[PDB]
Amino acid sequence: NIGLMKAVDKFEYRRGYKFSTYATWWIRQAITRSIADQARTIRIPVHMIETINKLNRISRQMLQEMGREPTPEELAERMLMPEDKIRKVLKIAKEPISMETPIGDDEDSHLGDFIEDTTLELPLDSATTESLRAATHDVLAGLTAREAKVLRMR
Amino acid sequence: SDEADEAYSVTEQLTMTGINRIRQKINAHGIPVYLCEACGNPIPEARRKIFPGVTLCVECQAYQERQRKHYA
Amino acid sequence: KAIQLHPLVCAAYNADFDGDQMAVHVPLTLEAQLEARALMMSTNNILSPA
Amino acid sequence: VYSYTEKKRIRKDFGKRPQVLDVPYLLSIQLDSFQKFIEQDPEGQYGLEAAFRSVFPIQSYSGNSELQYVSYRLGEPVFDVQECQIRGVTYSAPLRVKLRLVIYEREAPEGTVKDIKEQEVYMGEIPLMTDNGTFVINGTERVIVSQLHRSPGVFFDSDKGKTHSSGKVLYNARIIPYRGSWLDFEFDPKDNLFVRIDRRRKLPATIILRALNYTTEQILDLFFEKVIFEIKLQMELVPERLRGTASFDIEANGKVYVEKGRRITARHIRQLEKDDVKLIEVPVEYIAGKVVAKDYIDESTGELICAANMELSLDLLAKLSQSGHKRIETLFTNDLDHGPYISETLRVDPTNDRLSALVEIYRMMRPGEPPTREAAESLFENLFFSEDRYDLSAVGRMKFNRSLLREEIEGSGILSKDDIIDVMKKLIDIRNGKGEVDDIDHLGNRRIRSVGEMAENQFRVGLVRVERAVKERLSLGDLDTLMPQDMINAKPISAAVKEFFGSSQLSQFMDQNNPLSEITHKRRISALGPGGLTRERAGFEVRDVHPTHYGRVCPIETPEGPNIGLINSLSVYAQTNEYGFLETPYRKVTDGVVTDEIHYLSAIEEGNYVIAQANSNLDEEGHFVEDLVTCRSKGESSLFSRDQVDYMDVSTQQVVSVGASLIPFLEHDDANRALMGANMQRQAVPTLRADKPLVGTGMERAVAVDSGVTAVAKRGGVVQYVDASRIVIKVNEDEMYPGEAGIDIYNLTKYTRSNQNTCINQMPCVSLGEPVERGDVLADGPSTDLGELALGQNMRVAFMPWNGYNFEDSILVSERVVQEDRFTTIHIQELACVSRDTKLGPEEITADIPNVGEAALSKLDESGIVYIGAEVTGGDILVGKVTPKGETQLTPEEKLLRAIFGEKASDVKDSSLRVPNGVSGTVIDVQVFTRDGVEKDKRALEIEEMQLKQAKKDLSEELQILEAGLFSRIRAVLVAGGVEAEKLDKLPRDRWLELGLTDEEKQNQLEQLAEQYDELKHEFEKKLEAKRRKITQGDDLAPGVLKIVKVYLAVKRRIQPGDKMAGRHGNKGVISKINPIEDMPYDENGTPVDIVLNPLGVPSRMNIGQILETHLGMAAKGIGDKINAMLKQQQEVAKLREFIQRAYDLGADVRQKVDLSTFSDEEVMRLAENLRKGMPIATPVFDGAKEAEIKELLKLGDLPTSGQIRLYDGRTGEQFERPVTVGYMYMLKLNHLVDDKMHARSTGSYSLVTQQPLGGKAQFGGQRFGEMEVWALEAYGAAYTLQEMLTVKSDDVNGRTKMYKNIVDGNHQMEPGMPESFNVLLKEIRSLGINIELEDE
Amino acid sequence: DMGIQVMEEAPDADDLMLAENTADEDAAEAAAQVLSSVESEIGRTTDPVRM
Amino acid sequence: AGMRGLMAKPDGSIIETPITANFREGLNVLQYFISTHGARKGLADTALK
Amino acid sequence: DLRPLVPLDGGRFATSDLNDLYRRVINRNNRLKRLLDLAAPDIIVRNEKRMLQEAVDALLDNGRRGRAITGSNKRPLKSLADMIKGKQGRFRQNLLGKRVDYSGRSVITVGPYLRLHQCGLPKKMALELFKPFIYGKLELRGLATTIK
């Protein structure tokens, strides 16, 4: 109805065509554009969706026109994307996974229970870092006024 | 307790409870009534030789069992 | 690799030896070490609380 | 007489009852059921062709197109079992279907077609069942289970009075079709029949009779009995119909028959039928409560006085005499016998004819709308009487016409007006006590959906998913050059089928511990999944064992725990029906003789006959011997005479499954300890040297062979060559199939990895030149000794307390058990390392890695990978992988330290693969898989040329041995008819293409046989390219990864305090001590006991069969220590053949007759070699060793016949008094090791989402301190212990690193604060519009 | 949400004494206010698709 | 040593043909199939409790 | 960090369902913002406001209005109420039942040489559980200098 309101503002009945042919173009755009813009949790640009959609339309066709499977390096031949701008198309995920995903039947454990944080501070490295703070303070206790102070402010 | 010993206690409670609930329905000692308590029919003497204290006759009790077969 | 466990308290955990596993924790603080020693030691609890 | 393999070690067999049926092929369910799926049935009714004949032909809109089905074919698989298990792809075959699209024109809908379009389209790939009944799906071996779902048909259930508090049980009757409307009857609490069509609102159940066009007098004509009153005031009597307390006495003939008050008795109705009464005169009050049975008017004016279904009045009765009426009909409603239900449901029924009857039916289906006279009627008639809504299948009418006791075993697929009132007449009879209700757990109501029936239903749902495309593609454009390939996607039928085998809860991992674990796994019948119930609504209803389980499913073997009785185990001789029910063989009893024609009976047809027991004694003519024979009809088991019985059990093994048919003396164990022992036998780990059970059931050989882990000779012959990895059998001239090369190569399966991370390995038991037959075992699998199932070891056991070291359930184990390595098990772990593609660069697999200092790195090759053969330890680097990163923002006191020594930031990080903690093993395989864009490295090519020189050699070794069988097969021709004999081995063998013979068929066979050697050389030329293709080709990896290097360790685990040994009788325990060998109890021979067991487990857990096996273990090792002692002195065979024949012939009238008089002399010493450990004893399941036959067998040894010897203490040397039972129990080693259950964590990785420690032993996890461990901590006063178990030891991120510094500082004082489970909780309430905040003090 | 445990079949024996009835009665008071008042109009649904 | 006795049913009822045998002798196939109703009900109620 | 977007292996990801519910609210609010910027007819703005109100209901409690909307998984989404309420919720499953450092498990054996006040701890488990204690006592006695 957003494009339907915009189709009315650009509709010209002096051409004399029916309106159900003009606004069908805009609803073909505006539905598929918001499907392109606002449907995945990670936003893919609109043309890049059409890269997958062309790849979804072609690799389905070469599933039977070739034999068993289409290889990725075969898709470098059919579409004129040179084996790397075809590979990062299939690297992209798809509305990926929930983290209330049942593993399951363990403790009713979900996929959030087994994702580990790597960006935390493990307390062995932190007490290593803390004891390095004091082990520097004793080595800098073996220096005089000037040379320790420049080495504290370099 | 090995999970098949609590099974043993449950099964022995089952058997003992059911068998006591049956044996309470044998009405061992009673009075010689000589007449049924829903028909007034003469209950035969071999039947009281079997069960002392049958206030119901044979087939009126059979009707009672057939009525109680479902419930109510 | 198995926890060995005094045979008298097997009736207090209801723990037999057909393959039960006991989770073992460590009391870190001196307050929790003393709570362990003064309340939760297996000789301080030899009467059933029921 | 025995097989030649069977003469190596004959299991001496008790068990006096003879065997009529062999135990059939146990895997007939899986293999025979997937036979029916992937097979071309020309009258398409089974599997794939039936699915195609259901969905095809496809009509378009208005019939201007038609997609039609020709045939289908399974392609050849791209990979075999071994290649699919290596790369990890489904062992599937490409399903290609020959299709045909026919175009039509104007005025020719099926006349003149326009265009045909013949093509072979590829529509999805379907997974193939391999030779053992299993599937390869992602490399992993899956087993697709059968399902116990409820059948279609008619079901009469009850409510058991739990619906109402009044008490009254409410019988109901559901008619469940295949697809359609669940026509359900039920009773009111006040005895009024109801209907509802799809579990909707109720309607009074004469509405369904009125909509079938039955009027009120016709309804009462159906469901009632008619005594008729006439005038004066006479009622014609049925002599039986009076049973209910005499209301009015009798008035016939005036004199007497019996008077009022009392009961109508069996005396009285006898006297009324002997004195021949037919009519009685009755008072007017007797006809007051009766109900009028047909219409009645006055015949002067035709005016309605009283139609039927109306309470008769006495002025109304005299209204008929003044109407001139003679006949007055009424309904017979005895409150006990034929209660008024159809009458009193007409007394409520507001509708009276069919037009208003469909109104209530249409307003029950679709409310609100005004029911038009055609709109209501066309809904109803299509609902139960049309093939496109109400489908009742073949098994639906089979259960229908068998339930109401007809014999119309096949019929329509819809209901009829008589088919519905037959349900109501049966449900009335169930209310009236004629016959019993049906049961939820009858095995005549629970049908079996199996593998070939469940994959078909996932292929028919995918053939509606692709049908919506091509019905709407063929009606758009109708183009020619349009093929049947661009319409048919291969996706929606592949995603319907690789959902089922892929991830559905009836497609489980194959328990691969031992050959019992898999053979019980394919013969599992679980009542879960789609179609069947789940664990939620299961009861207390289907977890019980019902008497129709005899012969069909094991009463013993179910998994205990959450689903006991929900997962069953198929019995031994149990077979599935044509319709899908479980049928079990019974041998037919004639007049008085058990015949031999076995008949398989499903549980519907078992309750009709009288079936005897297999432990009934039989004469030599087949006659029963005793007059009263213990048999069993429908639910009871009473004493019937020998003429009236119909059937007998085939054998006494037929009630149990194959898991529980291996428990010796299972008669003497409880049903739950047998349930506990059948469970633990499938969790046994295979030991190093496989060891036979001394006390077996005789089933051990059959389960070993029928589970595919053995290498069974397909044909006879003599071994041309034996190897540890292959056996070459030169087939005899008898069975050589004259266009063949002569020999077949059994390629053995070496140290490969199980599903359960154990080792699967085949040891060839045969020797060189040893003649084998077909069927005979040549190589034993894992956990098999000489083609006999060998799940554990024979352990010289004792029964005594011994110092608390076997106290509650525990086991005290000798050091000799550990020294002899009887319980050492290999465990092959795979450990992979993946080089993925990160964002700032891909991860290399170099050997030059960061700071770890080139001591562990010397185990690495050039390419960063360990060598095959290397003996790793915990934390040792298996595969060196390094990952790029940034410089990572070096802190102060690192800018000073890295300026001192000057060594740079490494700039790469060291995410490499190392051995996890604790496991020390041997690297036995490394496989490098590469993406095609990535080139390779040195190790990936070194594995490749090693593979290629292996794959080219074995095909040459295929060829040079198949030639070396063919050049003797052709040599067999050159003896007769044109004979080249002395000049045969002189002329070169390549010019045996050019050798002259008398030109018969033989020289044309020589130009056939050697010409097939020319086919052997080109098939070798073609197959060497094929293993040049797949070995060299790049992997079709998951997108993102480059190099998956899959290292394969091998641990060789050994027994320790903590491992769980068990018996076969539910006697499990945990080894508590490895006592030294001098401290074990010994007898007066000095022989120490290997295992001491607690005897207190025996009287309470009443498994006496572990004491009887122990005494049969003392007898079996008694025989073996004289056969050993005679071979120790090299005794002559007159000593051996007169002892062993005596040993093989013991006890009462055993069916086993082995005569060593007709035995070769090198076979007897071979038989005595395999008996020098001990003679194996077969105790058949309910058939075997009586107690006197053990003591007699114990008296053949010089062992005391009570079973107990006098044992001396190991340490202090003084004897235990009151002598002790010793003997040989078969102890198992269960898959609960302490190497896989010990876990500890100080401080590991944490969880991201809430900052708690991770979960599980693999993730270096913590212990869950739940609700019940907190209340048991508040029940002490342990406040500070509980604060740290929610703050420091769990989640508070500041307070948990200020503790680890404080412990290393030596200060045990926490500064805890506020948990991170609670700030996450605080932000989630405040992410609602709820201002929950913390106050201030 | 009274909750009177609306489930599929005839319920068990122990699971009326195990299953609990919280909270009497004010939620049931306002639910009675609802359920005695939606016995009049037929056109009530809240779905934006249907409406 | 003595006889086993009357064996129960999941219906609460009692199977009127008792088990005249024991565990020092054996049980034949009929009595062993009779025992499994009570034992399976006992183990189900244990593992459900 | 309470509805994270963690990068898993191989390019794959894993989010929480609150991301989908907040995305639904932001979508409907941006579109309603345009539909009131555009002076649209009142029926489609009525439908947009009712949709945005429904999205706020699905975000705060997916199922109190009906029905609980499912994503590309056929279970309902976990909402904010479902993240505090429920058996798996933070109030039950994370405020008391929570995993714990300095802990471990193994099977039990008898070993009756013990007294009533001692358990038999294994040596690898006591090496693992008592790691910071071992480090403090090991460097206090100075047999190592660094905690490394």
Ligand SMILES: [Mg+2]
């Ligand atoms: Mg236990």
Ligand SMILES: [Zn+2]
């Ligand atoms: Zn009576």
